[PDB]
Design a binder for this molecule. Structure first.
Ligand SMILES: CC[C@@H](Nc1ncnc2[nH]c3cc(F)ccc3c12)c1nccs1
Length: 167
């Protein structure tokens, strides 16, 4: 039993809700919140900009030190950093950005990072400003993640479309 509330169950391990991931993280304080990161950990907009703003820019400060030490992530890769006031940990995961021409096949590799964590609060990878089809992202999530994932979808209209079209 966990503290996530109001989710629709899609499969044995995947759950979904129309919610603002920032507000959801502040309420649940999950062990792991997933950020929709880029390779530079520049949290300017989308989910990343919102999560970073909620940390009063502490996420960005920590991220800049991480990059200065380690260099950029790979597309499809991840790193574990602090969750600040939102979660114990933040798993920064880089899905391919279609608006940069990146290979959508890397979306499966991106979701594989979730399997290293027993329970996660997450957005749909490569959705929103990353330009992929969210219906496809949900399909890849369900077919790749085996651990327990609670998906927050900000847009109510999109949430209803994801549920109604789910196979
Ligand atoms: C992963 C893509 C998804 N983004 C989000 N998902 C869950 N929670 C979110 N909170 C936010 C707060 C913000 F300021 C900006 C963006 C988001 C956001 C979207 N898919 C379609 C349209 S936006």
């Amino acid at each position: 039993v966990n503290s996530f509330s109001g989710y629709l169950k899609l499969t044995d391990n995947v759950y979904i809700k129309n919610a603002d991931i920032v507000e959801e993280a502040k309420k649940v304080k999950p062990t792991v919140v997933v950020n929709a990161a880029n390779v530079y950990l520049k949290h300017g907009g989308g989910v990343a900009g919102a999560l970073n703003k909620a940390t009063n820019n502490a996420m960005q400060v920590e991220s800049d030190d991480y990059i200065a030490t380690n260099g950029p992530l790979k597309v499809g890769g991840s790193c574990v950093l602090s969750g600040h006031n939102l979660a114990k940990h933040c798993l920064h995961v880089v899905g391919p950005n279609v608006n940069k021409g990146e290979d959508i096949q890397l979306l499966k590799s991106a979701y594989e990072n979730f399997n290293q964590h027993e329970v996660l609060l997450a957005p749909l990878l490569s959705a929103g400003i990353f330009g992929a089809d969210p219906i496809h992202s949900l399909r890849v999530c369900v077919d790749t993640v085996r651990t327990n994932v609670y998906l927050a979808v900000f847009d109510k209209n999109l949430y209803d479309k994801l549920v109604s079209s789910f196979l």
